[PDB]
Design a protein around this ligand. Structure first.
Ligand SMILES: Nc1nc2c(ncn2[C@@H]2O[C@H](COP(=O)(O)OP(=O)(O)NP(=O)(O)O)[C@@H](O)[C@H]2O)c(=O)[nH]1
Ligand SMILES: [Mg+2]
Ligand SMILES: [Mg+2]
Lengths: 180, 103
């Protein structure tokens, strides 16, 4: 009976809650609702062994920055999320979320995650970005960020399409347990 | 206007010679009494008297609650002193939901 505390952080609307709901309840939310804080408990297997997962869903808005550090203590792994379509959320991975994590959680492993991957293959959206001289984030750019931040791994997923979702948390529990 | 006012109070049962009590001349006789009780009896053994630190206050905007404290990991140390956390420190909006429970 091994338990692991998982905490997700990332800019508001980058898709933290949708990632968890699809993983836990198997349901995707169409309407955006800013999360305050929630705890999802999930039983999973790791290399043939059951591992309970305490998972916390934080608020990415700037208005809850003073409440968020309450969930950092006793963390086993930190998922730093960003929106692939929003270059701003990719910057705040290093400008905003890394200093906040490095301040409190000096030793907790970091796993950078790129969300809303399904939006990369949307012509109507990428052209709106390309007309403004901006391209969606690519794999080698998400990797260099995880490297610059000092993350252990770097994964991508799409909550809208269930792809690579269950794999994100399997890697989270493996890093958390092997680093214990 | 008003005025600060230090007063000398004697309590019959406790037998202390005198107790300085800082009050205001605009304080009513009821406010002055409680100002004295909070100085002589808040530290007296009373199992049925809930004090803020014998009491937990949790906040849940969703399905899970979290404990709010006067000073925790989120407290910003402003000046000579650690600023005690407020309701707008935790950004507790109107219509929130709280839980009170003994330790
Ligand atoms: N197309 C697409 N939309 C997504 C995906 N994940 C989330 N979204 C959308 O993006 C918006 C934000 O989702 P949400 O999970 O609530 O983001 P959040 O990080 O939890 N916001 P906050 O941090 O303020 O609580 C919603 O409108 C949701 O439908 C995805 O994989 N694909
Ligand atoms: Mg949310
Ligand atoms: Mg704002």
């Amino acid at each position: 009976v091994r338990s692991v505390k998982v905490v997700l952080v990332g800019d508001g609307g980058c898709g933290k809650t949708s990632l968890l709901m699809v993983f836990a309840d198997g349901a995707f939310p169409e309407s955006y609702t800013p999360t305050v804080f929630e705890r999802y408990m999930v039983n999973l297997q790791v290399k043939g062994k059951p591992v309970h997962l305490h998972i916390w869903d934080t608020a990415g808005l700037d208005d809850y920055d003073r409440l968020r550090p309450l969930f950092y203590p006793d963390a086993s792994v930190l998922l730093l999320c960003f929106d692939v379509t929003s270059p701003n959320s990719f910057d705040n991975i290093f400008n905003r979320w890394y200093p906040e994590v490095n301040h409190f959680c000096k030793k907790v492993p970091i796993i950078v995650v790129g969300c809303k991957t399904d939006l990369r293959k949307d012509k109507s959206l990428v052209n709106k970005l390309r007309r403004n001289g901006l391209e969606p984030v690519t794999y080698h750019r998400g990797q260099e960020m995880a490297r610059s931040v000092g993350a252990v791994a770097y994964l991508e997923c799409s909550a809208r399409l269930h792809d690579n979702v269950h794999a994100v948390f399997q890697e989270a529990a493996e890093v958390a347990l092997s680093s214990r | 206007e008003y005025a600060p006012l230090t007063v000398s109070v004697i309590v019959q049962d406790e037998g202390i010679d005198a107790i300085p009590v800082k009050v205001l001349n605009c304080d009513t006789i009821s406010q002055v009494k409680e100002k004295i009780i909070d100085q002589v009896y808040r530290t007296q053994p009373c199992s049925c008297w809930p004090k803020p630190d014998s009491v937990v206050l949790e906040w849940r905007p969703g399905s899970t609650a979290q404990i709010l404290s006067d000073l925790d990991l989120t407290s910003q140390r402003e000046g000579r002193w650690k600023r005690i956390n407020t309701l707008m420190h935790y950004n507790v909006r109107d219509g929130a939901t709280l839980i009170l429970s003994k330790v």
